[PDB]
Amino acid sequence: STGSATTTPIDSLDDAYITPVQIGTPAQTLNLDFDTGSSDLWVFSSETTASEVDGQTIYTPSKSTTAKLLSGATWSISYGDGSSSSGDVYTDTVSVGGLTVTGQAVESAKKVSSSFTEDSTIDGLLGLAFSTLNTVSPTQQKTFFDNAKASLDSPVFTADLGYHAPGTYNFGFIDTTAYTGSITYTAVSTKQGFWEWTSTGYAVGSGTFKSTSIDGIADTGTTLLYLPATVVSAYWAQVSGAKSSSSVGGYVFPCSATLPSFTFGVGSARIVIPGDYIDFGPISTGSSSCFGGIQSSAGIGINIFGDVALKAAFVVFNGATTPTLGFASK
Numbered sequence: 357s358t359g360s361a362t363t364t365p366i367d368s369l370d371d372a373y374i375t376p377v378q379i380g381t382p383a384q385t386l387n388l389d390f391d392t393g394s395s396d397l398w399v400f401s402s403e404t405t406a407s408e409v410d411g412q413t414i415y416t417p418s419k420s421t422t423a424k425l426l427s428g429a430t431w432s433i434s435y436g437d438g439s440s441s442s443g444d445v446y447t448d449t450v451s452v453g454g455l456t457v458t459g460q461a462v463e464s465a466k467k468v469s470s471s472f473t474e475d476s477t478i479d480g481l482l483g484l485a486f487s488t489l490n491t492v493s494p495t496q497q498k499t500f501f502d503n504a505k506a507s508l509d510s511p512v513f514t515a516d517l518g519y520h521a522p523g524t525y526n527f528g529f530i531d532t533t534a535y536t537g538s539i540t541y542t543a544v545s546t547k548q549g550f551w552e553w554t555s556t557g558y559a560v561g562s563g564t565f566k567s568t569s570i571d572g573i574a575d576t577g578t579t580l581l582y583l584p585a586t587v588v589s590a591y592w593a594q595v596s597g598a599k600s601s602s603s604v605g606g607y608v609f610p611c612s613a614t615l616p617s618f619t620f621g622v623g624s625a626r627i628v629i630p631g632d633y634i635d636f637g638p639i640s641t642g643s644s645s646c647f648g649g650i651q652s653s654a655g656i657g658i659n660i661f662g663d664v665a666l667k668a669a670f671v672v673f674n675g676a677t678t679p680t681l682g683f684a685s686k
Contacts, residue, residue: 357507358528359455363390363517366477369636370663371579373517374477375525378451379462380420386413386479390525391577392515392551392673393660395489395499396433397450398441398463399480400472408468411476417464423448431463431491436578436656439471445492450500452482455527457504461490461497481577484513484673489549501527501675511675515576516686517667519633535670535684540625544679548658550575551673553681555661556623558583560591561616565626572659574666574673574681580636581618581629581664582653591618591650598648604639607648611638618650620665622683629668 363373374387379399386399400412417423423446432442443466450460465472465480472478483490487498505511508528516534517523524534545552550573559565570583588607592598594616598609609615615631634649649664672682 357455357504358509358526359451359453359504360524360526361453362522363525364522365518365520366475368520370517370520370667372478373523373576373663374479375452375482377482379415380417380448381422383451384413384415384420386415387477388480388482389478389577390482390484390515391575392484393573393575393577394433394435394481395483395485395487395549396431396463396491397461397480397482397500398431398433398443398465400468401443401464403443404465405467408473410473413479415462415464415480417446417448417462420448422458423462426461426492426495429461429492429495429497431493433491436660437471439469441465441468441472443467445497452500452527453525455504455508457500460500460503461492463492484576485551486546486549488546501673504528505675513673513675515666515671515673517576517663519630519667523667530672535686537685539670539672539682539684540622541672541674541680541682542622544681546679550658551679551681556621558587558621559619559626560594561631563594565619565621567621570620570659572653572661574671575660575662576666578660578662579649579664580660580662581650582656582660582662583650584659585652585654588650588652591616592648600652601645604645604647606651608639608645609648611644611646613646620661625683627665627669627683627685629665633664633668
């Protein structure tokens with residue numbers, strides 16, 4: 357089997373991407389944030405505290421003929437941005453882009469933090485990291501990908517995120533029309549439960565490539581590119597007037613600037629992030645200070661190749677017995 361679904365930016369900045377997901381019988385379509393940095397499929401639901409729902413579409417298990425309470429199971433998750441959610445669990449039929457999994461754990465939110473309530477465009481998350489990170493207790497559950505894997509034509513999914521445009525998540529096949537050149541594969545460590553890999557270095561604009569090992573995670577659920585302070589300082593030093601603002605919470609730059617590109621290494625291959633991808637616009641409405649898309653990972657404890665980096669590539673998440681990542685230009 358295979359699946360193929362379009363993923364759409366939630367706003368003009370590409371702050372996140374939503375993908376329609378069918379849950380239950382008859383289908384209830386929710387728009388979920390596919391997150392390769394976590395391993396829970398959780399939704400706004402009929403059980404979510406009413407004051408914490410503001411425009412999201414909800415899953416109502418009582419209206420699904422295939423829903424079953426997973427008796428005694430609970431979940432509770434905290435993300436890198438300080439957001440959180442928790443609740444109980446149903447199993448139900450879940451389809452993505454024509455690929456169906458029966459008996460998928462659908463984590464029904466009873467509580468969500470303010471950042472989730474305030475984002476009306478995101479109806480929940482679909483985690484695509486390793487199932488070792490799934491928070492369901494006392495019986496840990498499998499991700500949609502892990503449950504689909506055995507049925508897929510190839511044990512892979514691919515992320516093809518757009519810049520200010522829709523893109524695609526495919527399951528079970530590699531669309532050879534969706535990228536240019538060849539795919540470079542690189543090793544993955546699953547020790548922390550992430551798609552963790554080591555970049556071979558970086559360049560700023562037209563500058564020379566610096567060969568240096570940068571361990572980090574491929575995380576579709578993180579907007580920005582978070583790298584070591586040395587790397588980030590070297591980037592922003594090439595932008596007149598850029599500075600790190602403790603008041604704003606990262607590097608800002610004059611909105612009048614033209615940003616340089618950023619290159620990262622994948623083995624001997626190179627992925628170029630155009631400068632425009634690094635512009636996250638005014639810090640507040642009407643400001644002439646703009647927020648940067650490359651930020652320091654200092655204090656986060658991991659480097660994160662978020663959407664800013666991933667959207668510059670066609671990315672293969674190879675879930676074979678020995679997992680690997682692949683990157684291609686596009």
